[PDB]
């Protein structure tokens, strides 16, 4: 399964992984907003939005 | 702005804040001292100390910082940092710790006529005597004195502050209702302000702010009075139990152990001042002595109950008096029961009268309407 | 006119306090320091911190601050404030808080030949692990480590002071103006220069001067308030064997009330023992043992009551008498052995076990 | 030395500590950050604060503080104070109530090539996530996060000098053991700004609480009272000591609850093993009281059935006490 | 390094004065926008009513003097200057127990070519905030941090709120910013509402240091787990034993012992809870109300079983009749009083347990002040 | 004032604050140091420290700070900040954990003749000498030693301003009463230095604790427990009630031991009077436990036969089932002797320091 | 009888009292060696050397 592993608005970058899920994690801190991308989709602290997905390259 | 910079450069060309302003040699600078009490933090009596957060109003006329606003783009007042302008050393004198000077150095406000204003906030920890003889049902005077540490009455003349619209002086600690939090255990009844001199020292003068505050004892009332009332009820009940149950000492000494437990509870929260005994400690000791006498009299009752003709012979005086008051062993239990009922009535009278007298003495303690200040 | 003004203005002119006073390269400033303890303020085992008031003196040489006494009206000693001169940054490294430096920055006494005599008083919250094995009958071996904070062994040479030609390898104590802490007595007080051979000549941690303080606690407050009350109260569990085993004999309440009093003493000792989890305190071991003894007392009372109220009462009394001696002997030998072990714990008569010297004037 | 005086004078004639020491403002100042653990002052579970004594090793190159040793008598190292040069403002991103930056000056070593070696001490009070679930047999993995407060990655970059902190001079805590300790450098990018990295270093220490103080202070008496309370059932009901022994061991357990509640941390994040075992003992005692009151009621209502009930209850409560003290 | 030339031109060549506020004429106002990032909530221990918390208060103001042309120099887009060289508007926390009014670390500022200065100094603040113990330990505390500008009046500087952008529109930051990833929840306190408000007091005049205010409220609800495990459950169980003491026969004269010992355990629990609360007399704590109710009930238990014991041991100078009278009155008293205790405890502890915060701060304001749904 | 500004500018032009004010280096600065006890903040015995709020008043003449009042318009007193002139460094030698020197500046008063009038405040945490032997009826005599740190007698000489410390504005402590306060000055010479005196001024205050808090919170419950523990012997053995009374009064006394050790200072220099009394009461209660146990064992003896015991216990009754009678006689004998022991011990433990 | 009342290395001075013994109390402090002389001799703290002498002019 191929999905983006970049962070925030970097140039796109992909990685191979055995999980059937790929997530986009977005949250805001005292400076700005952070977008985190990777495989699977684990539990997150309250106040963070997550985008569990199943197809290839869907966490853009 | 550029004009403000020009005015600041002109004013501070030859001005040093280590020289007292004086038109003529020997002149006095009239300093107005005021106080706004933001909140009364704590008045813990273990260390005999009161902590307050206050704004200390100051107002003195400095002739060197005056100008013509018509020549400076119509600017009437400036905000100059307090370290760039002379200020009197108006400090707290009766402070428990070593902090004399104001905590926060806000910049001063100077008008074009030379008038200078200062409202520096401070966390003042002042020491004040605690009249612990009606504790906790007490009110504390707990004064707070302000004066210039270095300048005396021959160089400065302290005065009372002025209200917002300034025609008449204010002689009391004013409170901003927008920024004020009640302590929750103290209520500010009187808050006068008065200048003090000393006849022995003609070179002395201060401005003093008092706080006649009366404690709210609900916490102490509940947490000590109510269990003490229950302990007194147990101690008065232990007589009504029959001697044959053989369990009077269990109840009596359990009540005494409980009252010692509340002594342990309260020993932390009572001040360690030896001037006088507070009401609450006197009440605790009264209850403890009452329980001790209950134990002693119940031991007497048990001893009279278990006496037998084979060991004790009835004297004539107890027979007539205890079989007089009601208006061979069976006589022993009868005398035991009569003595028990007499002790029950006697301790009812003693406990009720003592408790009512103590609470009436501690309830007629009210701060005077005139704080004599 | 005070000519000391002329000397100060001449010496401090073109004098930089950020410069090592080395004349050239390969010149090492020999710093001689001796410690004079004034008060042993406290030692709290909860924080594992030792508080003392000490007057450390530091001596060293500065070639830039020497003059000719003949041309300056014959004066040879001048006092210069410490903030205007270069100072060797000797600090107490093993401190619980961040107070590395001295408390009072006293004036520095300069001499004709550029010698220095700085005696700044200081209060140090030094750290030392607590050996709780023999508490409260314990002796603590607390240290005070002094090393230069910035300069290494190639720039300064820390060493002990030399008085009358012999190095003062001890913490100086004023015999007539010193009072005991009241809980701790000072037995040994050696001082030795130490090297960290695991670390090279550089890196500022090679050399150090260590001032030891072997102190033994005075166990008078603990005995009369914790130890003796505990042993006296729990000596009462052997009296359950003389009470009758019937209704009103009333053994179980005595045993359980002595146990609850021991629990109250466990609360009382909870505020005194430290939080170190390396060894069980000796008094803690005794408390656990004596509660176990009370446990045997309670169980034995239970079986005695069961037998005397079933079987027959006389066999119950025989069991009672037989086990009374066992319980009394057990309690006596346990308490005697524990308190003998506590008492026999004494400070070693050598400050360093392998070093034959006494390290005392 | 007069030569070193000439160094200190010449190097600081036109030196601004306000301005970072880089040849061109586009470039970045590279800093190698290192941590040297010394001791653990304390670990506060209720306040979730870990206080430690550390010295922060910082190395970086200054281009404006170069000199030729041959021109100045051959010296190659000086000891300028901190307040005379530029300083990276390394701060704790998870400070609880300590000092964010470093408040100790501790004059820094300066090589002739411009390299600067600064090792100031600090008392880091890092906010620590305390997990009270296996207390006291618990493991702590709370860290300290370091980073440049005002400069970003493309201006001032910090790199760890070693993959793990320095514990060559560590002093044993007495109640904590370091299983592992490492250091990681994090790259974080913001949506505002695709090419502005922000760098930080987190030094995480694994800590094992030594379970001896709480075991001999809190665990032994819980088991002690628990084994007591099941023993009351073997007493004959004829002796009037059944309720006395049972309620008195309950009262001793109450005083023990008092000492525990003043001893163990008061944090309410989760119930620990201490809390679970205290609850188990308390429930055991309460059930013992209730059922043995029923036993006395059976006696004074029957003696044989009361005795056999007492033996059965004794066996059952021995069994459940053993399984409860083994499971927890 | 063009930074040297830029700093020298800005601060020294132009004669920058840090003691004069940055206005063109002395009639304009300086717009100062504030935020507050709560790094962590340290504690709110109730003895001193202190709210100690590490916060990251963020400033943003315009300084026309700290401007330059980027193209004239090298393309220097961001500049950094220590606070002691630039005009820093000192706002202070008006309510604090200790004497710390300013921020902890006076960190470096960031100034842009247009003069936009941003300052984010970390600070540890120990504010004074009252505590209502009425529903302890199930209570929620609503106490705040109050920030005021005591150096300049509202006629000179204005303390606004930070405004950000999502879709090209500006909306004020009306809440305390919490970093969801970095923030670890406190072990005793749970943050429910974090509203931020700018306060203007019409009572006073603009030419005064106490006309404007920015308040960062914090409504936090305690986690009732420690107290329901070490204070509620054992007390309830021993109260249940006190109630059950009536089911003990009077033949064994040992009921007084059980009742009085339960009362003494109640006294021990009172000792324990007396050091967990401030000496506040506004209202009785729920623990206090429950404890005094249960101790009064246990005293009634003691008195009533004493009546039973006295009735049992009566003599004509037949005894089975007195024994049955005692048993009957004991059963009647149990049936009367045990439901009273059970219902009272249940009612008290469900009344305390039903104390969720009103889910809407500033009751006369429909806005929930939540970061999920901004205003503009 | 412009005149005062000109005067301040003139005085502080060539002035140097790091040189003592003497015309010739052989001279010494004459300083008159005096104290003003304002309050006695606290006296903790466990750390053996006394802390008080004072302000030490010292006077000296600075020759190079003089001026002619007629030249400057007539000003005679000026108020230079203390940070810019020469200051003697008086250091509390027995400082425990406070400040060796002062930290407050509190600008001084300067006279036209050069005299300097400087009264800065300071909280002295002076080390104390605590003797806990008659506590709480204890009198303390710990001192407050001051002297110049870096200078000696021949360079900076200090003398007391008044023979006694100034206590005109000393507020009452509330738990201490002061008998005597006194000020002494000592010269010490060293085997070095045959003509180099070293000077100091030692102020000692005789402090007596006000014994009312400890008497009515720590002693009266001890009296009650001591009276009650010996009264169990009046309670007949027939009721299984001696044991509960005696062990429960012991347990209550143990709780009172908890509170007393929470209150009493934890110093271990010597056993205090309160500690001696509580140890006596512990021993008394324990002895009552053993005596009650042996009495109970006597009561429930039953046929072994009763021996001379009946010869003396059935002559003792003549000067005021058989096992119960002898137990009763023994109980009354022990009650009498235990009341006597309790009262004589209570009188004797506090006999002295009260008579 | 007559002893010496001088201290350390001061010029010799003599005094008379009712005690028939002298003493020379010598101890070391942080600045030098102190010698205290008079008549009689009391108990002293450890670390101090005494020369309790019964003859006349013997505490020199
Ligand atoms: C209170 O506590 C203190 C410390 O906490 C106790 O003081 C300790 O006393 C011990 C007993 O004397 C000391 O052990 C002795 O240490 C010395 C010195 O050890 C150092 O040097 C060793 C040798 O280094 C040379 O050789 C190496 C190999 O060739 C070379 O590589 C190197 O460059 C050197 O040339 C080194 O191996 C070691 O690691 C040290 O750095 C030894 O010579 C003795 O053999 C030790 N044993 C004895 C019996 O003397 C111990 O050093 C000392 N600690 C400290 C910190 O000084 C004190 O005794 C306690 N008081 C009590 C218990 O009453
Ligand atoms: C609170 O204390 C102040 C002074 O400590 C009291 O003020 C004195 O009042 C009396 C009676 O009018 C005057 O004779 C004194 O001159 C006042 N000053 C002093 C210094 O004693 C004040 O009366 C006290 N308040 C109350 C309510 O008792
Ligand atoms: C939390 O406390 C704040 C301040 O104490 C409350 O805000 C004020 O509440 C009062 C009471 O009705 C109103 O009159 C004011 O208009 C409110 N605002 C200000 C600025 O004072 C707030 O309502 C409280 N919230 C909760 C949920 O208790
Ligand atoms: C502030 O403005 C009011 C409005 O008229 C005025 O009455 C008052 O005098 C002003 N205060 C100052 C200090 O200028």
Residue numbers in the entry:
A (entry chain F), G (entry chain G): 1 to 60
B (entry chain B): 1 to 323, 325 to 328, 424 to 469
C (entry chain E): 1 to 310, 439 to 489
D (entry chain D): 1 to 301, 399 to 425
E (entry chain C): 2 to 318, 442 to 500
F (entry chain A): 1 to 303, 306 to 309, 311 to 317, 319 to 324, 397 to 431
Give excerpts from the publication:
α-neurotoxins are peptide toxins that are abundantly present in the venom of elapid snakes and that competitively inhibit the nicotinic acetylcholine receptor (nAChR) to abolish normal neurotransmission thus leading to paralysis and subsequent respiratory failure. α-neurotoxins are high-affinity competitive inhibitors of the postsynaptic muscle-type nAChR, located at the neuromuscular junction. Short-chain α-neurotoxins are composed of 60–62 residues and are connected by four intramolecular disulfide bridges. Each subunit consists of an ECD, formed by a short N-terminal α-helix and ten β-strands, a transmembrane domain (TMD), composed of four transmembrane α-helices and an intracellular domain (ICD).
Here, we determine the cryo-EM structure of the muscle-type Torpedo receptor in complex with ScNtx, a recombinant short-chain α-neurotoxin. The dataset allowed us to obtain a 3D reconstruction with an overall resolution of 3.15 Å and a local resolution better than 2.5 Å for the extracellular domain (ECD), including two bound toxins. The overall architecture is consistent with previously determined structures of the Torpedo nAChR and consists of five subunits, αγ-γ-αδ-δ-β. Similar to the receptor in complex with α-(α-Bgtx)14, two ScNtx molecules are bound at the neurotransmitter binding sites located at the αγ-γ interface and the αδ-δ interface where they are stabilized by interactions with both the principal α (+) and complementary γ/δ (−) subunit. ScNtx is pinched between loop C on the principal subunit and a unique hairpin in loop F on the complementary subunit, thereby blocking access to the neurotransmitter binding site. Whereas the position of the conserved arginine residue at the tip of finger II (R31 in ScNtx, R36 in α-Bgtx) is similar in both toxins, a clear tilt of ScNtx is observed towards the complementary side. This results in the bottom part of loop F being tightly grasped between finger II and III of ScNtx. Interestingly, the side chain of R31 of ScNtx (equivalent to R36 in α-Bgtx) adopts a different rotamer conformation precluding the formation of a cation-π sandwich. Instead, R31 forms two H-bonds with αY190 in loop C. This αY190 adopts a key role in accommodating both ScNtx and α-Bgtx at the principal side. In contrast, nine different residues from ScNtx form 22 VdW interactions, one H-bond (between δE182 and K45) and three salt bridges (two between δD165 and R28 and one between δE182 and K25) with the same six receptor residues. This observation illustrates how the tilting motion of ScNtx toward the complementary side results in a much broader network of interactions.
